[PDB]
């Protein structure tokens, strides 16, 4: 394959999701849906009476479900959150303003999302493709928590002052908005709960938002495939437009990102409704894109595999990353994986490389890392692999407590 494409759909489950899923199924591909469960409560200001049906269909069809937060941070778009808050924020269009405030409350939205999903579909944890507690993506934000050495934020994703299209819009990555700072904290809080978060390389969106029925201008399949070709191995998270979609410090050439393109789009762009005739005009674009992308040599995969699963029989080079039972690991020495030699907290063959900050066992800590342990912060003074006896509060030759 010349590459791997990860189709990722945000903001479902809504009525529009149903036909999208069927197009994916007809195309013989799996995708990842980052869901907001407020649609299940009927307060997300979309056609969403089939929300539960859509959730069931995505899961029964084998697509991966991940976590986009319960309400898409709309509680930060309004004064008091309630059943009309989606409509109100849609009225004002202030989604990108003050999007993140209290990072603790905002992170908690991701856990509430789990509660609501498991309320409406009590059997959801019986699905191996339910990944709501492992894979997340922040609203508005092209941010990444993939490995210890693959993390980067969307430094101008959201704003404190005014929406980005306007004269005088200021974006300083070195001194980001309050909303962006808070969102960075949200990322860290999720990573410490074991989440990975992923941004995107290309955004399948209206070419022109100013025309009537803007959804109709979704990029046609042929030129969209052109965008994907251009993104392939080109660190497009740094070059993408608009500015609020950029990942300024994305680690270009990082090994896990090679030969891969993550596509972001939205289920709601594919319905005939308030944004245009998205079903009529866009379902065929999705279908054709899948076909021509395969013709060109691409294969489609899902985000649970973006970090490849540890696999018995495969030989690994030192430095390579795998995902095993939800945890990221990096090979310590080159070897061939065998049944009893899986990654773990005690394996000599692997170290834990989750994108987290809480002190953890079997991590290869580097000079300058800061970890949290029993409510305090510690600076790593000497590189080493962590172990049970070497806790930060008892190893002053390895850690120094910060103020």
Interacting partner of 90 out of ligand NDG, Na ion, a second copy, none (Cβ under 5 to 8 A depending on kind): ligand NDG
147/126 Cα distance (integer angstroms): 27
Choose which of 5, 6, 7, 11 interacts with ligand NDG (CB under 6 A). 11
212 versus 375: smaller Cβ distance to a second copy: 375
Please say which residue, 32 or 281, places its beta carbon nearer to Na ion: 32
The listed partner (Na ion, a second copy, ligand NDG, none) that binds 72, CB under 5 to 8 Å by sort, is ligand NDG
Check residue 25 for interaction with a second copy (CB under 8 A).
no
The length of the chain, given as a count of residues: 403
Least separation in angstroms between residue 127's CB and a second copy is: 5
Q: Is 389 exposed, middle or buried (0-12, 13-18, 19+ CB in 10 A)?
A: exposed
Query: Residue 271 contacts by C-beta under 8 Å, 6 or more apart in sequence?
Result: 14, 15, 16, 19, 47, 278, 279
Residue numbers 264-283 binding ligand NDG by CB under 6 A: 275
DSSP output for 83-144: TTHHHHHHHHT-TTBS--S-HHHHHHHHHHHHHHHHHH-TTGGG-TTB-TTTEE--TT---E
What is the contact mask toward a second copy in residues 102 to 131, using x (rule: CB under 8 A)? --xx--x--xx-xx--xx-xxxxxxxx---
Q: Which helix (H) or strand (E) holds 23?
A: helix 15-26
Told to check if 47 binds ligand NDG by CB under 6 A, we report no
Q: Does 154 bind ligand NDG (CB under 6 A)?
A: no
**Contact status: 339 vs a second copy (CB under 8 A):** yes
Binder of residue 243, out of ligand NDG, Na ion, a second copy, none (CB less than 5 to 8 A by kind): none
Angstrom distance (rounded) from CA 290 to CA 298 = 9
Residue from the set 3, 13, 66, 86 that interacts with ligand NDG by CB under 6 A: 86
Write out the DSSP string of 159-191: BSS--TTSTT----TTS--HHHHHHHHHHHHHH
Cα(315)–Cα(335) distance, integer angstroms: 5
- For binding to ligand NDG (CB under 6 A), which residues are involved? 11, 45, 72, 86, 90, 95, 275
- For binding to a second copy (CB under 8 A), which residues are involved? 56, 59-60, 104-105, 108, 111-112, 114-115, 118-119, 121-128, 189, 192-193, 312, 324-325, 339-342, 344-349, 358-359, 372-376
């Amino acid at each position: 394959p010349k590459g791997t494409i990860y189709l990722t759909f945000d903001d479902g489950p809504v009525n529009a999701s149903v036909e999208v899923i069927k197009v994916l199924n007809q195309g013989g591909v799996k995708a990842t849906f980052y869901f907001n469960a407020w649609h299940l409560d009927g307060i997300g200001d979309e056609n969403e009476d089939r929300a539960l049906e859509a959730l069931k269909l995505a899961l029964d069809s084998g697509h991966i479900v991940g976590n986009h937060s319960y309400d898409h941070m709309i509680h930060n778009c309004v004064e008091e959150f309630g059943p009309t808050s989606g409509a109100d924020c849609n009225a004002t269009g202030n989604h990108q303003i003050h999007s993140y405030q209290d990072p603790v409350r905002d992170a908690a939205s991701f856990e509430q999302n789990l509660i609501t999903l498991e309320k409406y579909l009590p059997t959801i944890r019986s699905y191996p493709n339910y990944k709501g507690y492992e894979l997340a993506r922040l609203p508005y934000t092209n941010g990444w928590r993939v490995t210890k050495h693959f993390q980067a934020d969307g430094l101008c994703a959201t704003s404190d002052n005014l929406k980005p299209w306007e004269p005088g819009y200021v974006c300083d990555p070195a001194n980001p908005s309050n909303s962006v700072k808070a969102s960075i904290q949200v990322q860290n809080i999720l990573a410490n709960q074991g989440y990975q978060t992923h941004g995107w390389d290309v955004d399948w969106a209206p070419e022109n938002w100013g025309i009537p029925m803007p959804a109709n201008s979704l990029t046609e399949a042929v030129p969209f495939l052109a965008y994907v070709d251009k993104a392939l191995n080109s660190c497009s998270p740094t070059t993408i437009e608009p500015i609020n979609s950029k990942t300024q410090e994305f680690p270009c050439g990082t090994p896990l990102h090679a030969d891969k393109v993550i596509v972001l789009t939205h289920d709601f762009l594919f319905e005939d409704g308030k944004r245009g005739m998205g079903a009529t005009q866009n379902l065929p674009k999705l279908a054709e894109f899948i076909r021509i992308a395969k013709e060109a040599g691409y294969v489609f995969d899902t985000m649970d595999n973006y970090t490849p699963r540890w696999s018995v029989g495969k030989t690994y080079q030192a430095g390579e990353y795998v995902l095993y039972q939800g945890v990221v690991y990096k090979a310590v020495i080159s070897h061939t994986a065998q049944q009893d030699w899986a990654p773990s907290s005690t394996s000599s063959l692997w170290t834990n490389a989750d994108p987290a900050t809480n002190w953890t066992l079997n991590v290869s800590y580097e000079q300058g890392d800061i970890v949290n342990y029993k409510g305090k912060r510690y600076l790593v003074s000497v590189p080493h692999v962590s172990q049970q006896d070497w806790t930060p509060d008892t190893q002053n030759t390895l850690f120094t407590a910060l103020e």
